[PDB]
């Protein structure tokens, strides 16, 4: 996260760290959506142009974390993956269309002050909140600059941007399964997700029921926090039918 701030304790209790078993390193962010299911970006797991294709046994999920590198004894919980599910029409060849994947855990994680699932939006919350100008919140342990590595989880609030401004900011083909967020150059404030923040949640707090909903997944960007560029997020609601099919078929 660029130009964000340190998280408060317990501020994002659905934040998941995807961790590589060997060499031991952060691979991506992710989110907890129930005691056995974790949501991330497909590109976190599969991206053939970069020779990336992880299998279940390659990874761990670390939940309840705050510190990036420390083992947070008696607080974090480390979980093994039962199975990975990638969207069958995830477009790694062109533009990361439908950049979404689910991971089922081997055993259910215990909820705590630091571990708690986020909600997924239904059609009305999405219709109500996913509007240009409305702000969401992105969290992660990714780079602090385009070209560290924070000591602890970082957070930044960013406004959703109008789809024509999203489209006009890039040469990549944008789809309805994506949205973009960030400040415009004349708006003064800055902030963005960056490498390492991949797969983490873009959340909004509904003013109707005061619950946090995951509206996006950190997906892609050109550089980080550049003027006239925006971060792109997978549109969780548009892919929710796939999400529910997987959990309904596989548990």
């Amino acid at each position: 996260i660029v130009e964000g701030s340190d998280a408060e304790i317990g501020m994002s209790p659905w934040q998941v760290m995807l961790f590589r078993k060997s060499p031991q390193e952060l691979l991506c962010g992710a989110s907890l959506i129930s005691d056995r299911w974790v949501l991330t970006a497909a590109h976190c797991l599969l991206y053939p142009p970069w020779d990336k294709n992880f299998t279940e046994n390659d990874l761990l999920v670390r939940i309840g974390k705050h510190s990036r590198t420390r083992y947070e004894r008696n607080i974090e919980k480390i979980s093994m993956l039962e199975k990975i599910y990638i969207h069958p029409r995830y477009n790694w060849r062109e533009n990361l269309d439908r950049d979404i994947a689910l991971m089922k855990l081997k055993k259910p994680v215990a909820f705590s002050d630091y571990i708690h699932p986020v909600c997924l939006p239904d059609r009305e919350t999405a219709a109500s909140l996913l509007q240009a100008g409305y702000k969401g919140r992105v969290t992660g342990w990714g780079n602090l600059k385009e070209t560290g590595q924070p000591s602890v989880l970082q957070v930044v609030n960013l406004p959703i941007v109008e789809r024509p401004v999203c489209k006009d900011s890039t040469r990549i083909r944008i789809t309805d399964n994506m949205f973009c967020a960030g400040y415009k150059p004349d708006e003064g404030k800055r902030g963005d997700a960056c490498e390492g923040d991949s797969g983490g949640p873009f959340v909004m707090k509904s003013p109707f029921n005061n619950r946090w909903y995951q509206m996006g997944i950190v997906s892609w960007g050109e550089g980080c926090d550049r003027d006239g560029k925006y971060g792109f997020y997978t549109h969780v609601f548009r892919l929710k039918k796939w999400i529910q099919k997987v959990i309904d078929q596989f548990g």
Binding site: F19, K21, S22, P23, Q24, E25, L26, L60, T69, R70, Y71, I78, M80, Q149
Partner: peptide, 11 residues
């Protein structure tokens, strides 16, 4: 490279 080691039971 800077990650503290996790309990061996998880690997």
């Amino acid at each position: 490279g800077d990650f503290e080691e996790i309990p061996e039971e998880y690997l």
